[PDB]
Amino acid sequence: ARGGAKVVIEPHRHAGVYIARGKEDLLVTKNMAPGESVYGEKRISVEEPPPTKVEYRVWNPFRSKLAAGIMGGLDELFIAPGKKVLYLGAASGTSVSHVSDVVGPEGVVYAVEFSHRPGRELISMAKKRPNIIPIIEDARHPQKYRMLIGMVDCVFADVAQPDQARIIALNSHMFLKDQGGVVISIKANCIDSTVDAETVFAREVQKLREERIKPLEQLTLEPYERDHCIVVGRYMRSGLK
Amino acid sequence: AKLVHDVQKKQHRERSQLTSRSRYGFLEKHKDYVKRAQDFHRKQSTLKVLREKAKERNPDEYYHAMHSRKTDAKGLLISSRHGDDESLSMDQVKLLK
Amino acid sequence: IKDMFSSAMEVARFEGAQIKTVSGIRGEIKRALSKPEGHYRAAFEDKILMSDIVILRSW
Amino acid sequence: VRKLKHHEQKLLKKVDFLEWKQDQGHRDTQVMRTYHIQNREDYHKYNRICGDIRRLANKLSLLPPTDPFRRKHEQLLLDKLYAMGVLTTKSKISDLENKVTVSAICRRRLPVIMHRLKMAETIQDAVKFIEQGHVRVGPNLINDPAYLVTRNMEDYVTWVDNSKIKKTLLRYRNQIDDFDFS
Amino acid sequence: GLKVPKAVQKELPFKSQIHQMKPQKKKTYMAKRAVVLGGDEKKARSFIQKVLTISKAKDSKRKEQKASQRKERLKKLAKMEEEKSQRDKEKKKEYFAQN
Amino acid sequence: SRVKKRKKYQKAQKKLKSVRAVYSGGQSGVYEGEKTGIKKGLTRSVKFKN
Amino acid sequence: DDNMRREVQRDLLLIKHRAALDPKRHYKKQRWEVPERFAIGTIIESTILETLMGDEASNKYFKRKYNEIQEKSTSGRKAHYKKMKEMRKKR
Amino acid sequence: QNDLELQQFLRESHLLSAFNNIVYQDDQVIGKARSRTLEMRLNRLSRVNGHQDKINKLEKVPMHIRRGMIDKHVKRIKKYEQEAAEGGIVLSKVKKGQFRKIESTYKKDIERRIGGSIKARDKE
Amino acid sequence: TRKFGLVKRTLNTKKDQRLKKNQENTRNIPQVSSALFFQYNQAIKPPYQVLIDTNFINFSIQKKVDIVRGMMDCLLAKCNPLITDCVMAELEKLGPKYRIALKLARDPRIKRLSCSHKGTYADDCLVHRVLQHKCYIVATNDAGLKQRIRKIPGIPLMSVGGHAYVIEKLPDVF
RNA sequence: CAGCCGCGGUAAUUCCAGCUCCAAUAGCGUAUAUU
Ligand SMILES: [Zn+2]
């Protein structure tokens, strides 16, 4: 895949995601702000009828755990066009841009980041992408931005902390709708470096079950990542049974 | 091979057609004969089925496709090469020319 | 079949014998042809080929 | 009727407006759909005839097995039904209870006979061709679809002369002779 | 190929009749009319034909190799089935002696 | 015997890649893509049952 | 449109049959069919057919493999039959 | 005991008594007696090598219908035993779980519907 | 003009949606665990986590083997014994003949483990835990559950045999 | 079922190239007894 190479862009099974077919397949998203690259990724220009230029961006699975999961074969991605997503652990916003591309103009991405210096980049990106709201605040205390966030459709959590289960529970009990989706990226080394990764994943899944999130499906992100897991689950406030 | 020497399992090589008989071609063996005989038996079986069907045909059968299909003077079915028509109207012909 | 024998007397002693083809097709010597002398008629279980060789096993 | 809720179904387990136990699974409607039976009472007349056959077979069975009366009457019944065409075989006595069905009689009706004779592509086509006056059984024209064909009478089920169907098939084979009227 | 005699073809039933086209002797107007490009289009036609030929040959090769593999491992599983059946036959008689 | 254990380990290491996805380190060159393709109908996520 | 599929249909064949483009590159088993909706794009940092015909080593490989397939296809057929029957007529 | 027709006549003496209202021979016996005696003989032959579940399977009956039939039959059996105990009359011994065979059993053909005993209590 | 072959409209039991039987009318291949070699579970290491089944406790009491002490002697490493809600519910359903087993299960060295499934079936619950995560060791003496755990690769099995516990399919125990 | 045996040939012939695969390894099998 080089410059000037032709590809055929067709829809993925997931809504808002596309595949560029060629000698090598690519996962792509439709660019909200055409003509710019967030982190120097390859971009694909499609002329569509006067013809107006439409541009797509390549989603790197080594750079984004969500792309690694989609390529590894998740069944249910709750992130969809038009939906409200609460992104926890926004960082510079590389995967946040792709989440914004997936949810599209009608969607809203509440991107919560604690550190101020990646928060500057997140705020600057939010100008070109109007559906991203930067929340420069600790995700461990959701009561601070309760005036800012209301009733999201999905919660994605990419934060790597030992208490991420309590963080996810505290945000889901306030902002997540019932029968909503929770997509969690788990790093066993960041959670507990002593015990093995299978033990870490099992304990985190059990903690979600205690906090009333029902795990639907389980995935390990190889060969893109080592000892990284994605848990997709449903917030059943009524009852898991 | 529990109790067989590897000298017991030597390869016995195949013999060829005689040079005086080389005009007739390759010397068949059982492997060639089986292919020839199987081909003949398959052909004869389907020919027997066709003969039986031709014998047991009912003269009084009627199909709606008899209005479409045609039979030539020899008594065989006419199958159109291009038809799925063949004739062009004068309006089409004028534009094409 | 030709070249097996040299005369109809030689054929007539061996009439009724098993013969076979290098292919493996089995047959029987049936009668001696009048002309030419060494030739004979044989019946096999299948059609044989002009590339075939007919063999008769004796001791 | 809308779909019952869970608490309603428990109080209304027996409720069904479309399937009743007296309908017997709509077996009659199934058989008439299979063999294009137009009259509504034909299945039940056939069923009464099948019931007579099965009642007589049951009585012959309750007779002792080494009874010349029983053996003679069972062979008489098997031969008569086989000659009509209701029974495909004469081998077993038990076919007089197992293989006597309404469908067995309905397979001897004229449109089913024509469809098996390849005269018509469907039984419904055969029905229409019968009512339209194309079919004769011997010299006699039959415009009744309910007419039952015997094994002997199969050999004279043919197209009527001067039939457009007969002219069409002869014209297809290029064997139409207008002296014969086709 | 199979050669059906023309008498049988003449007497075959309507469903069972054989469709056999004749060659055409005369050039039709559409045959004369048809335009065939050259140069780069001819080279593209050559390229596509070679690519499709290689694709079909490769698919056939892979199917034949898979067929050989499944035949061998089916034979192995047949042997395993016989030995397991014999063991279960022995075990049933050994049980029923106790019961 | 050491050489045969070595070649057995190489064979098993080649076979494990066909059995399942194996971490081989992160990408070093630029992202060329998926050299074997992307399937949208196949799901490899192990699903929780009750 | 129909015209769009007509003008790009070879590009959509070289992707359907991409497993027969490089002897060293092998793909996962995908029975790819042309979708009802698609688009043709260009990567920002000449169609696939033109690039592949511009590559000369690939053309040499395609020609060699095609000739081998031709040998396999024509062996044992009518030409063999006629040569075998001519050997009998010659003497 | 090795003799056959004597043991058969003893076993089927109740059916012949019930339905002949002797004609014990197979070339003379007709009707329901013939049908039920053939069924008894065939069931007895099939019992030893047939799995009991596939051999004896009751006719499907609704719960309240079958429970009422069993209750009325048990009332009949208990009444019969009570009179045969008051007027001191010796009766054949019957097993603890199984029902007692009586004339109502043989005439009504109740054994097909309610079975010889209660399989649930027999299992427990 | 009238059509030919006129028939009375009736209920088509094959194709009518109002009837119940007609009213009734992606591929998932799970990934192989990265904890596993071809049959060897390499991620597992002490302290092990042992899912206990009810009959394991009963045979432990019959053979007078301490649970935590016996597991530590069997494995020569520290262990965490886990009793699920369905296992404790099965012990409670066992009745008043098993209150000793109930109390020895209530022992605080055994850590409880919550269940979010309907019913109380320890066999399917433990097998589902096993098929999800490869970090557990299944302690049981049930023949069927033993066969299921033996069919699942990478899962150690503990049993009560003779005087002490015996381990199976754990290469580390020498 | 099997096949070191073929038709010539023993300086005679270069052939399923020495048929392929598996496991332990200075060790590795069999028989019988026994937990
Ligand atoms: Zn449980």
Q: How far apart are CA D167 and CA D176, in angstroms?
A: 7
Distance CA A6, CA A100 (A): 26
Contact at 8 Å (CB) between C25 and C55?
no
Closest CA to I40 of I132, I173, I171, I129: I171
Within 8 A by CB and 6+ apart from G89, the residues are: none
Residue I115 CA to ligand 1 centre (angstroms): 5
Detail the DSSP E strand segments found in chain G: 39-44
Ligand 1 is a single-atom ion; what residues have CB below 5 A from it?
Answer: I 84, 86, 115, 125
**C-alpha F37 to ligand 1 mean position (Å):** 40
| Cα gap I26→A75, rounded to integer Å | 8
Question: In terms of C-beta distances under 8 Å and separation of at least 24 residues, what long-range contacts does C24-30 make, across chains too?
Answer: C24/B29, C24/B30, C24/B33, C25/B33, C25/C52, C27/C54, C29/C1, C29/C56
C-alpha–C-alpha distance, residues A204 and A86, integer Å: 20
I9 CB-near residues (< 8 Å, 6+ apart): none
Whether the beta carbon of B31 falls within 7 A of nucleic chain J: the reply is no
Task: Tell me the residue length of chain H.
Answer: 124
- Which chain G positions have a beta carbon within 8 Å of F37's beta carbon? 27-28, 30
Q: Quote the CA–CA distance of A135 and A122 in Å, as a whole number.
A: 9
Quick check: G28 and F36 in contact, CB under 8 A? yes
Strands I157-161 and I136-139 come out as parallel
Task: Count Cβ–Cβ pairs < 8 Å, chain E vs chain G.
Answer: 39
Measured distance CA(B70)–CA(B85) in Å, rounded: 15
Local structure of C19: helix, strand or coil: strand
Phi, psi of A52 (to 5 degrees): -115, 135
Token pair in block for residue I54: 């009810």
Distance in angstroms (rounded) separating the CA atoms of residues G61 and E58 = 14
D143 contacts in chain I (CB < 8 Å): none
Q: Do B17 and C51 touch (CB under 8 A)?
A: yes
How far G87 CA lies from chain B's nearest CA (Å)? 6
Distance from CA of I25 to the nearest CA of D (A): 15
DSSP, collapsed to helix, strand or coil, labels residue C51 as coil
The CA–C1' separation of B27 and J4, in angstroms, is 27
Is C22's CB within 8 Å of B18's CB?
no
Q: Judge whether residue B6 contacts strand J, using its CB and a 7 Å cut-off.
A: yes
Q: How many CB pairs under 8 A join A and F?
A: 75
Do A91 and A113 touch, CB atoms closer than 8 A?
yes
Q: Are the C-beta atoms of A32 and A129 separated by less than 8 Å?
A: yes
* Alpha-carbon gap, residue F15 to B2, rounded angstroms: 30
D20 in contact with chain I, both atoms CB, cutoff 8 A: no
Distance CA F31, CA I138 (A): 44
Q: Is the peptide bond before C36 cis (omega within 30 degrees of 0)?
A: yes
Q: Which residues of D touch H (CB under 8 A)?
A: 61-66
Nearest to G69 among E44, E47, E54 (CB): E54
Q: Look at the block and give the residue holding tokens 């479409």.
A: B68
Print the SS3 string covering H47-71: HCCCCHHHHCCCCCCCHHHHHHHHH
Neighbours of chain D (3+ CB pairs under 8 A): B, H, I
Helix axes I99-106, I54-62, angle to 10 degrees: 110
State how beta strands A176-187 and A152-157 pair: parallel
**Of E40, E42, E46, E47, which to mutate for an interface test with G (greatest number of G Cβ within 10 Å)?**
E47
CB contact under 8 A, C24 and B30: yes
Give the single-character DSSP code of D40: S
| Subunits with 3+ C-beta pairs closer than 8 A to G | A, B, E, F
Cα(I168)–Cα(A14) distance, integer angstroms: 44
Does the CB of B30 fall within 7 Å of any strand J atom?
no
> CA dist G68 to C55, E48, G59, G62, G75, Å?
40, 17, 14, 10, 11
Q: Which residue has the tokens 């062996």?
A: G75
Bridge partner list, C41: C31
D54-86 as b/e, with b when 16 or more CB fall inside 10 Å?
A: eeebeebbebbeeeeebeebbeebbeebeebbb
Among candidates F31, F44, F47 on the partner chain, residue whose Cβ is nearest the Cβ of A72: F44
A196 interfacial to chain I (CB closer than 8 Å): yes
DSSP B66-77: GTT-EE-TTS-E
DSSP character string of E9-42 = HHH--TTT----PPPP-S--HHHHH-----THHH
Please tell me the distance between residue I152's alpha carbon and the centre of ligand 1 in angstroms.
Answer: 18
Taking CB atoms and an 8 Å cutoff, what residues of chain E touch B79?
Answer: 19-21
A42·F47 Cβ contact <8 A: no
Residues 6+ positions from D77 with CB-CB distance below 8 Å:
D53, D56, D57, D60, D96
**CA/C1' separation H26–J10 (Å):** 88
Declared resolution, Å: 3.0
Is A206 in contact with I113 (CB distance < 8 Å)?
yes
Residue H112: its H or E element: helix H111-114
Q: Say if the Cβ atoms of A13 and I26 lie within 8 Å.
A: yes
List residues of B whose CB lies inside 8 A of any G CB.
23-25
Looking at beta carbons, which pairs linking B77-81 to residues 24 or more positions away fall under 8 Å? B77/E9, B77/E17, B77/E18, B77/E19, B77/E20, B79/E19, B79/E20, B79/E21, B80/E21, B81/E21, B81/E22, B81/E24
Shortest CB distance from A6 goes to which of G35, G37, G47? G47
Scored b (16 or more CB within 10 A) or e, I96-131 reads eebeebeebbeeeebeebebbbeebbbbebbbbbbb
Q: Left (φ > 0), alpha (ψ -120 to 50) or beta: where does A98 sit?
A: alpha
* Residue A141 structure tokens: 């205390």
Substitution target in B23, B27, B28, B39 with the highest count of G β-carbons within 10 Å is B23
Contacts of G69 in chain E (CB under 8 A): 53-54, 57
Q: Which of F16, F21, F41 minimises the CB distance to I31?
A: F21
CB of H25 within 8 Å of a chain D CB? The answer is no
Q: Which F residues 5-44 have CB within 7 Å of strand J? A: 8, 11
Separation of G67 CA and J17 C1' (Å): 28
The answer to whether residues D168 and B66 touch, using CB atoms and an 8 Å cutoff, is yes
Contacts B24 to C, Cβ<8 Å: 49-51
Please name the residue that has the structure tokens 């301490």.
I66
- The reply to whether B1 has its C-beta less than 7 Å from any atom of strand J is yes
| Chains in contact with E, counting 3 or more C-beta pairs less than 8 Å apart as contact | B, G
* Distance between Cα H117 and ligand 1 center (Å): 39
Q: For residue B61, is it left (φ>0), alpha (ψ between -120 and 50) or beta?
A: beta
Q: Which residues contact A6 (CB under 8 A, 6 or more apart)?
A: A22, G11, G40, G41, G42, G46, G47, G48
Rounded-to-integer distance, Cα C41 and Cα C39, Å:
7
Strand partners, I51: I82, I138
